Amino acid sequence: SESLLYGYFLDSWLDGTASEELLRVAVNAGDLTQEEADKIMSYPWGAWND
Amino acid sequence: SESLLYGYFLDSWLDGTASEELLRVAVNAGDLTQEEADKIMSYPWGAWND
Amino acid sequence: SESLLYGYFLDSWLDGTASEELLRVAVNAGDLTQEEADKIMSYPWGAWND
Amino acid sequence: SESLLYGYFLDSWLDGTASEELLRVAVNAGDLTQEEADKIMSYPWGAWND
Amino acid sequence: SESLLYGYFLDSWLDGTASEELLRVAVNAGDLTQEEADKIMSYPWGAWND
Amino acid sequence: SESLLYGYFLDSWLDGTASEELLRVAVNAGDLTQEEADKIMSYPWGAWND
């Protein structure tokens, strides 16, 4: 099952506030797994603003 | 029982921010089941903005 | 106990965004029970905007 | 322990959106206990807007 | 562990909406412990608006 | 596992509302561990506003 903040970091990618770097900071923080970051990046960045 | 982000992706369809493609990205990500996507699409898209 | 999205659909009725039809779509989706829809409709629709 | 929507209905009283009637509709709906409604009404109504 | 509404009442203190009186109403309501109120008051009131 | 308010205090750092002092108040309150504060500070402060 996913990290507690997966939905939070996925939302920030989809609303265009998060960057590639931020997600990696979260990976090294342990708030996301590497696999989760790669999954979030598979979404259209800033899709909510389209 | 539903995927953790079902209510999140249902809300984005109902508020008119999500698209058909986005839901399918979530299906292949494993954040939604195929059945859940098809269920969300059964709702009036952008119903909150009506 | 109630469906996960009961509080969500109750809020949308109370803030005047949801309709009678939408609640029934949710009933047939299985995101609300028939009894839950009938309960939500017992509230003043758009009570938050009054 | 409290009804799931206690914090929701307490917030609506504190932000000045809920009324005495609404809380009682929730009591008869079973979304709040009578004791919970009486507790919420013990707070300053619309305290967040003060 | 903390009362369900601890994070809610802490947020209202930090965003400058809650007062000393409100927190005490919550103490007597049983939505916060006395110790929790005293803890919340240890934060800079309206810190989010600074 | 993390303190209940970790995601809350991480969000306030990322949206630029929280300060170094605030996080330390939360450390001494016991709403965050020292390790959690140091982790939150490893993120770009006010990253959501960038």
mmCIF file of N, CA and C in Angstrom, chain F residues 3-41:
data_model
loop_
_atom_site.group_PDB
_atom_site.id
_atom_site.type_symbol
_atom_site.label_atom_id
_atom_site.label_comp_id
_atom_site.label_asym_id
_atom_site.label_seq_id
_atom_site.Cartn_x
_atom_site.Cartn_y
_atom_site.Cartn_z
ATOM 1 N N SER F 3 3.964 11.392 13.113
ATOM 2 C CA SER F 3 2.982 12.107 13.915
ATOM 3 C C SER F 3 1.789 12.475 13.043
ATOM 4 N N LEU F 4 0.604 12.487 13.650
ATOM 5 C CA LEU F 4 -0.648 12.756 12.938
ATOM 6 C C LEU F 4 -0.592 14.037 12.106
ATOM 7 N N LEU F 5 0.095 15.049 12.629
ATOM 8 C CA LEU F 5 0.136 16.365 11.998
ATOM 9 C C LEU F 5 1.364 16.598 11.108
ATOM 10 N N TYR F 6 2.055 15.522 10.727
ATOM 11 C CA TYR F 6 3.233 15.641 9.861
ATOM 12 C C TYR F 6 2.885 16.246 8.503
ATOM 13 N N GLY F 7 1.857 15.696 7.858
ATOM 14 C CA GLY F 7 1.390 16.184 6.560
ATOM 15 C C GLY F 7 0.871 17.608 6.615
ATOM 16 N N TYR F 8 0.291 17.972 7.757
ATOM 17 C CA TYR F 8 -0.210 19.323 8.000
ATOM 18 C C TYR F 8 0.930 20.340 8.103
ATOM 19 N N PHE F 9 1.950 20.010 8.895
ATOM 20 C CA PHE F 9 3.100 20.896 9.089
ATOM 21 C C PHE F 9 4.045 20.922 7.886
ATOM 22 N N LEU F 10 4.059 19.834 7.117
ATOM 23 C CA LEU F 10 4.824 19.774 5.872
ATOM 24 C C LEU F 10 4.192 20.671 4.809
ATOM 25 N N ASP F 11 2.860 20.677 4.768
ATOM 26 C CA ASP F 11 2.099 21.510 3.837
ATOM 27 C C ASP F 11 2.293 23.000 4.121
ATOM 28 N N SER F 12 2.340 23.353 5.404
ATOM 29 C CA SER F 12 2.513 24.742 5.837
ATOM 30 C C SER F 12 3.915 25.283 5.544
ATOM 31 N N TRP F 13 4.894 24.384 5.490
ATOM 32 C CA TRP F 13 6.259 24.731 5.107
ATOM 33 C C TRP F 13 6.341 24.916 3.596
ATOM 34 N N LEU F 14 5.672 24.024 2.868
ATOM 35 C CA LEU F 14 5.678 24.035 1.407
ATOM 36 C C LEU F 14 4.852 25.169 0.797
ATOM 37 N N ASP F 15 3.806 25.600 1.502
ATOM 38 C CA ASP F 15 2.992 26.730 1.047
ATOM 39 C C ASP F 15 3.496 28.071 1.596
ATOM 40 N N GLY F 16 4.635 28.030 2.288
ATOM 41 C CA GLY F 16 5.292 29.236 2.802
ATOM 42 C C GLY F 16 4.687 29.935 4.009
ATOM 43 N N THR F 17 3.801 29.255 4.734
ATOM 44 C CA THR F 17 3.153 29.859 5.906
ATOM 45 C C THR F 17 3.895 29.582 7.216
ATOM 46 N N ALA F 18 4.537 28.419 7.301
ATOM 47 C CA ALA F 18 5.269 28.021 8.502
ATOM 48 C C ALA F 18 6.698 28.550 8.514
ATOM 49 N N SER F 19 7.234 28.730 9.717
ATOM 50 C CA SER F 19 8.616 29.149 9.902
ATOM 51 C C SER F 19 9.405 28.081 10.656
ATOM 52 N N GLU F 20 10.710 28.312 10.785
ATOM 53 C CA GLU F 20 11.612 27.435 11.524
ATOM 54 C C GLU F 20 11.205 27.343 12.996
ATOM 55 N N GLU F 21 10.810 28.484 13.559
ATOM 56 C CA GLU F 21 10.384 28.593 14.953
ATOM 57 C C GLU F 21 9.115 27.786 15.226
ATOM 58 N N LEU F 22 8.128 27.931 14.341
ATOM 59 C CA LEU F 22 6.841 27.240 14.451
ATOM 60 C C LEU F 22 7.021 25.725 14.528
ATOM 61 N N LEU F 23 7.868 25.189 13.650
ATOM 62 C CA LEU F 23 8.172 23.760 13.629
ATOM 63 C C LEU F 23 8.791 23.287 14.940
ATOM 64 N N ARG F 24 9.587 24.155 15.561
ATOM 65 C CA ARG F 24 10.241 23.839 16.828
ATOM 66 C C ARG F 24 9.271 23.906 18.008
ATOM 67 N N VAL F 25 8.301 24.818 17.929
ATOM 68 C CA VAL F 25 7.192 24.883 18.886
ATOM 69 C C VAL F 25 6.403 23.573 18.842
ATOM 70 N N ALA F 26 6.226 23.051 17.630
ATOM 71 C CA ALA F 26 5.542 21.781 17.405
ATOM 72 C C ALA F 26 6.359 20.594 17.909
ATOM 73 N N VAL F 27 7.685 20.705 17.817
ATOM 74 C CA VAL F 27 8.591 19.703 18.383
ATOM 75 C C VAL F 27 8.464 19.681 19.906
ATOM 76 N N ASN F 28 8.505 20.825 20.526
ATOM 77 C CA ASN F 28 8.371 20.799 21.945
ATOM 78 C C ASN F 28 6.976 20.506 22.435
ATOM 79 N N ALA F 29 5.966 20.766 21.590
ATOM 80 C CA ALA F 29 4.580 20.397 21.900
ATOM 81 C C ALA F 29 4.372 18.888 21.813
ATOM 82 N N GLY F 30 5.195 18.229 21.002
ATOM 83 C CA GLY F 30 5.082 16.791 20.789
ATOM 84 C C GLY F 30 4.163 16.456 19.630
ATOM 85 N N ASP F 31 3.855 17.465 18.817
ATOM 86 C CA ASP F 31 3.040 17.285 17.616
ATOM 87 C C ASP F 31 3.905 16.893 16.419
ATOM 88 N N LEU F 32 5.218 17.041 16.586
ATOM 89 C CA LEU F 32 6.214 16.563 15.634
ATOM 90 C C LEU F 32 7.420 16.049 16.408
ATOM 91 N N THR F 33 8.114 15.061 15.853
ATOM 92 C CA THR F 33 9.400 14.643 16.403
ATOM 93 C C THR F 33 10.478 15.571 15.848
ATOM 94 N N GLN F 34 11.624 15.634 16.524
ATOM 95 C CA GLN F 34 12.752 16.449 16.066
ATOM 96 C C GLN F 34 13.182 16.042 14.656
ATOM 97 N N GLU F 35 13.183 14.732 14.423
ATOM 98 C CA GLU F 35 13.549 14.135 13.143
ATOM 99 C C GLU F 35 12.589 14.542 12.026
ATOM 100 N N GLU F 36 11.309 14.681 12.369
ATOM 101 C CA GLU F 36 10.282 15.111 11.421
ATOM 102 C C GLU F 36 10.456 16.570 11.012
ATOM 103 N N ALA F 37 10.819 17.414 11.978
ATOM 104 C CA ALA F 37 11.070 18.832 11.725
ATOM 105 C C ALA F 37 12.264 19.027 10.796
ATOM 106 N N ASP F 38 13.297 18.243 11.031
ATOM 107 C CA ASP F 38 14.486 18.295 10.256
ATOM 108 C C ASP F 38 14.216 17.768 8.828
ATOM 109 N N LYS F 39 13.321 16.818 8.691
ATOM 110 C CA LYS F 39 12.894 16.329 7.436
ATOM 111 C C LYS F 39 12.090 17.343 6.633
ATOM 112 N N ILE F 40 11.162 18.023 7.286
ATOM 113 C CA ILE F 40 10.337 19.063 6.665
ATOM 114 C C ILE F 40 11.207 20.222 6.158
ATOM 115 N N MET F 41 12.244 20.556 6.925
ATOM 116 C CA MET F 41 13.172 21.637 6.575
ATOM 117 C C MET F 41 14.132 21.293 5.426
#
